[PDB]
Design a protein around this ligand. Structure first.
Ligand SMILES: NC(=O)c1ccc[n+]([C@@H]2O[C@H](COP(=O)([O-])OP(=O)(O)OC[C@H]3O[C@@H](n4cnc5c(N)ncnc54)[C@H](O)[C@@H]3O)[C@@H](O)[C@H]2O)c1
Ligand SMILES: NC(=O)c1ccc[n+]([C@@H]2O[C@H](COP(=O)([O-])OP(=O)(O)OC[C@H]3O[C@@H](n4cnc5c(N)ncnc54)[C@H](O)[C@@H]3O)[C@@H](O)[C@H]2O)c1
Lengths: 474, 476
C-alpha cells in the first residue's frame, strides 16, 4: 500500500486502486483512488512555488538521482516487474535507461542555447542587440502509459527539474507504484518537494483535472490514439505535446547476402519482442521483399524459437507477460484472423493467460488487423512485399501511423530513397525502429503525434518560454 | 469601387453575394470581395494538400526576392490600397510596405540556411557506433488567418516562410481589410510562385471561418488576432498544431533615475509608440507607467510632443495620424477615456474626435484598473498611469493585466534594467525602446493571454512550418 506523493507529503483516500501482477493476477499493491481535488491541490502548490535552484544545484539533484537508480536497480526493477509483468531482463534494462535520462538531463544543465541578434540589418536598422533567455512555466501536467512505468516518468520529470519547472504526474492506474517510488528517490536526492507531485486514481475521476486545471501551461501526454484525440478535443488554450501510437516497420531489402539476412533476422526478433513487444517503436510489421523472404523467414523462426518465455521474475526469462490477459487474447485473435485470411502461422506454442509466446506468422496480409492496427505485443509478423521500392514505400506508409522505421540494405541510393520516402519521425538504417539515444529528437506525425519532438533536449526547450530583451549598442 | 474575386491557386473565383469593404475616413464602399463559403476553403485546401512543391532553395529565394522587388516598385499603389481599406495614414501604409519588403527579403535570404544537426551515439553504456542526422520536411497544408491592422504585413509574415519552406498556404484575411491580401497573391503568382502554393479566400467568419480551423488536410493553423477569437480557434482546431498570437497591452515604463533630458527622450518614445499605425499594433504603447517622482516633469514633455501630430485625411501627405478601423472603435476608445476621467483621470489634450478619426488624446493620472488601460484599447490614446517609486510595486502593476506580449523600460541603471528584464511576465523587454521594437527575424510572441506560447518572426515560423525527420547510419 502506497499513498499519493503531493509535494513531498503522503496523501491517502478511503477508496483504493488495486494493482495486480499480470503473471499471477494477484494484488501486489494498492494506491489511492484520487479525485479532481487532489490534482487541484498538486497544481496550486506547483503554481505557487518558484524554483530558485542554480544550474549546479539542478545538476547535483539529477546526478544523485541517477546514482540512486543505479544503487537500487534490483529493488526498482522488481517493482516494475511486479506491476507490469515484463521479464527482470527487460525491467533491469529499463532502469539502465532511466539512469541515462537523468544523467544526460543533469549534464544538459550546463548548456545555454541563448542567441544574440544584431539590429542594423535593414534601412530601418538600429544600433542595438537582441538577446534570448529561457524561463520556466507555471506548471506542467504529465500523463504516462503503462509500458515503461519508470522511464516514461523519467523522460517527463527529468527535463522539468532541469529547467526549474514544477510537474504533477498522473501515472497509469495499471502501473503506478514505480512512479511513486521515483518521487521518493527524487525527494531524497534533494529535489524541493513542491517541484514534483505524483497523483493516482481512475481516469474518470482525476484525468480531466490533469488536462484542464487553470495553472497548467503545458500538458505532456504519451499513450493511445483515442485517448490522445480525446485530450486534443479538451485542453483549451494550453500547449499539448501528444505522443501517440506507433506501428513501425523493419524493412528487409532484396540486396542482402545470406549473412546480412541473419543479422536482419536478429534485429527483427529483438525489435518485435523486447519489453514483450510493448514499445511504441516496436517492430510491428516486418516488410520483407519477395525474393529474399524464402531465405529470411527460416532465420527469423530459428531465432524466435530460442526465446525463453515464462516467469518474469526468473532472470533467465527473455519474454515476460503482456500487460493483462485481455490484451494477450486480443493479439492471439488478430493472429488467428490473419491466418484465416491467408497468413501461415509458423510458431505458436500457446497462450497462457497474459503470457504470450513470440508467435511467428508469415505471409501476413498488409490490410489485416494484426499489421494495419497497432498490436502492442510480442508478435513477429512477416508481410511479404514486392521487389520494388516504390510499392514497398507506398505500403509502408499506408497505415494511420508514422513514428519510426528500420531499413536493412547496403545500397546507398536505396537508403536515401527510404529516408526521403517514409512518412515517419525517424528512419534507422540497419537498426530497429526502436533505436534512439535519450537526447535525440523523438516524435511522430500522422496519428502517432501532434508534431512536437521529445527526448531530453527538445523536452527541455518545450518546457520553457523564450523571452527576448534588447539593449542599446552604439 | 473595385470589385475583386478570390484567388484560388491562381484562379479568379467570384460569388454572387459580396462583402462590402468601406473606407473608414468617409465610410463609403471602396471595394467588394466574395462572400466565400466553406466549399471555397475546402477546394483551396484540397489543392494545397495534393500539390508537392519541388522548388529548390535557389528557386524559393528568387521568387521571394522578386516579390520584395515588386513591393518596392509598387509601394505607392500598394499603400494606396492599404490606406483605402484600413484608413491609416499614407505615412504608415508606406512604412508597412517597407516592412513587408524586409519580410520577403529576409525569408529569401534564410533559404540558404540549413539548421540540421548531427548526434554521435557512443555516449552511454548502450553506445553504438552510429550517427543520427536531422532534416526538415514540409507539412500537408497550412491555414493562415490574419487581422485588420497590417493588411499586407501580416499576410507576408504567414506566407513568406511557408514559401521558403515548400509549404502550401491558404489565407483568409479579415473581411475588414481583404483587398491588400488579394493584391499580394497577384504579385506572388507574377513573381513566379507555383500557384497551388497559395490561395486567398474571403468571406464572413460565420460562413468560411470554421472550415479554416477544421479542414482535414490542415496540419497547422497560424492565427493572429483578438483574445476571444483566438480562444475559439484554440478550442476548435482539434489535433492540429496551433500558432496563436493574440492581443497585447504593452507598457512603456519610465523609471525615476532619468534626467530631464532622458525624460524628453522617453516622451518621444511614448508618443511614437502610443500612436504609430493609429495605435493599431498588438505591441503599441497602451499604458505609460511613470514613477511618481518624475511624472510632473515627464507629462508636460509628453503633452508637447503629442500636440505636434497632424491627424486628418489619411490620403493627405501632410497627415501623420489617420483614422482607426471604424467609427464604432473610435467611439469606444473615446468613451473609455471619458470613463477614466470620471474615475479620476485628467484629460490634458483632446482636440475632438470626428467619426473614425481619433486625435492622439493625452490623459494623465489614469487609474490602472480603469478599462482604458486594463483592457486592450487598440487606438492612439496616450495614457499615463502614475506608479509608485518602487520597482517591486511597479513590476507587480505592470504584470497585473491578462496580457504579456512586449514591454519597454527607460532607465540608465543596469541593476534596475536586469530586474525588469527578469521580472516582467512578457515575451520581450526592450530597454530604451518602445515595446513594438523588433527585427523581422527575432523570435516574436507573448505569454499569458497574449499567445499560446509559440514564437513567430521569419526564422521561428520557418521551423514551426516543418517536421523534423531524423535518420541514423552505421558509423564504425
Ligand atoms: N512516444 C510515443 O509515441 C509512445 C511511447 C510509448 C507508448 N506509446 C503508446 O502508448 C500506448 C500504450 O499505453 P496505454 O495503454 O497506457 O495508453 P492509454 O492511452 O490507455 O493511457 C495512457 C495514459 O492516459 C491516461 N488516461 C486514460 N484515459 C484518460 C482520460 N479520459 N483523461 C486523462 N487521462 C487518461 C491513463 O490513465 C494513462 O495514464 C500504445 O498505443 C503506445 O503506442 C506511445
Ligand atoms: N502578434 C500578435 O500577438 C498580434 C499582432 C498584431 C495584432 N494582434 C491583435 O489582433 C487584434 C486586432 O485584430 P482583429 O480585430 O482583426 O482581430 P479578430 O480576432 O477580430 O479577427 C482576426 C481574424 O480572425 C477572423 N475570425 C473572426 N471570427 C472568426 C471565427 N469565428 N472563425 C475563424 N476566424 C475568425 C477574422 O475574420 C480575422 O481574419 C488585436 O487584439 C491585436 O493585439 C496581435
Amino acid at each position: 500500500h502506497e499513498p499519493m506523493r503531493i509535494a513531498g507529503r503522503l496523501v491517502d483516500t478511503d477508496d483504493r486502486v488495486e494493482v495486480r501482477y499480470p503473471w499471477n493476477d494477484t494484488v501486489v499493491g494498492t494506491v489511492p483512488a484520487g479525485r479532481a481535488e487532489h490534482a487541484r491541490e498538486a497544481f496550486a502548490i506547483a503554481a505557487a512555488y518558484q524554483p530558485k535552484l542554480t544550474r549546479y544545484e539542478r545538476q547535483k539533484i539529477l546526478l544523485a538521482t541517477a546514482e540512486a537508480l543505479a544503487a537500487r536497480k534490483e529493488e526498482i526493477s522488481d517493482v516494475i516487474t511486479l506491476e507490469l509483468g515484463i521479464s527482470k531482463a527487460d525491467s533491469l534494462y529499463e532502469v539502465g535507461r532511466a539512469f541515462d535520462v537523468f544523467t544526460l538531463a543533469g549534464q544538459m544543465c550546463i548548456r545555454d542555447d541563448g542567441e544574440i541578434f544584431s539590429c542594423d540589418l535593414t534601412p530601418h536598422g538600429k544600433a542595438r542587440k537582441i538577446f534570448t533567455m529561457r524561463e520556466p512555466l507555471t506548471a506542467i501536467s504529465a500523463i504516462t502509459p503503462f509500458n515503461h512505468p519508470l522511464n516514461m516518468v523519467a523522460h517527463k520529470v527529468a527535463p522539468a527539474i532541469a529547467t526549474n519547472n514544477c510537474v504533477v504526474v498522473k501515472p497509469t492506474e495499471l502501473t503506478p507504484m514505480t512512479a511513486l517510488l521515483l518521487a521518493d528517490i527524487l525527494y531524497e536526492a534533494g529535489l524541493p518537494p513542491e517541484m514534483l507531485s505524483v497523483v493516482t486514481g481512475w481516469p474518470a475521476d482525476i484525468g480531466m483535472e490533469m488536462i484542464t486545471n487553470p495553472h497548467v501551461d503545458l500538458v505532456t501526454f504519451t499513450g493511445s490514439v483515442p485517448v490522445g484525440k480525446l485530450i486534443a478535443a479538451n485542453a483549451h488554450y494550453k500547449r499539448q505535446v501528444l505522443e501517440l501510437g506507433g506501428n513501425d516497420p523493419l524493412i528487409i531489402l532484396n540486396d542482402l547476402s545470406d549473412d546480412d539476412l541473419a543479422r536482419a533476422a536478429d534485429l527483427a526478433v529483438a525489435g518485435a519482442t523486447k519489453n514483450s513487444g510493448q514499445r511504441c517503436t516496436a517492430v510491428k510489421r516486418i516488410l520483407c521483399q519477395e525474393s529474399v523472404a524464402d531465405r529470411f523467414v527460416p532465420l527469423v523462426l530459428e531465432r524466435a524459437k530460442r526465446l525463453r518465455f515464462g516467469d518474469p521474475m526468473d532472470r533467465s526469462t527473455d519474454l515476460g507477460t503482456v500487460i493483462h490477459e485481455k490484451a494477450a487474447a486480443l493479439f492471439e485473435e488478430r493472429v488467428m484472423r490473419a491466418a484465416e485470411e491467408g497468413a501461415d502461422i509458423l510458431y505458436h506454442p500457446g497462450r497462457s493467460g497474459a503470457l504470450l509466446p513470440p508467435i511467428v506468422v508469415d505471409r501476413v496480409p498488409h490490410q489485416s488487423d494484426l499489421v494495419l492496427e497497432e498490436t502492442f505485443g510480442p508478435i513477429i509478423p512477416i508481410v511479404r512485399v514486392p521487389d520494388d521500392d516504390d510499392a514497398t514505400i507506398t505500403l509502408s506508409n499506408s497505415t494511420a501511423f508514422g513514428l519510426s522505421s528500420g531499413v536493412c540494405t547496403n545500397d546507398y541510393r536505396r537508403m536515401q530513397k527510404y529516408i526521403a520516402g517514409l512518412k515517419v519521425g525517424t528512419v534507422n538504417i540497419w537498426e530497429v525502429p526502436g533505436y534512439r539515444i535519450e537526447m535525440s529528437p523523438f516524435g511522430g506525425i500522422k496519428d502517432s503525434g501532434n508534431g512536437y519532438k521529445e527526448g531530453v533536449i527538445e523536452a527541455m526547450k518545450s518546457f520553457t518560454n523564450v523571452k527576448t530583451f534588447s539593449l542599446p549598442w552604439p
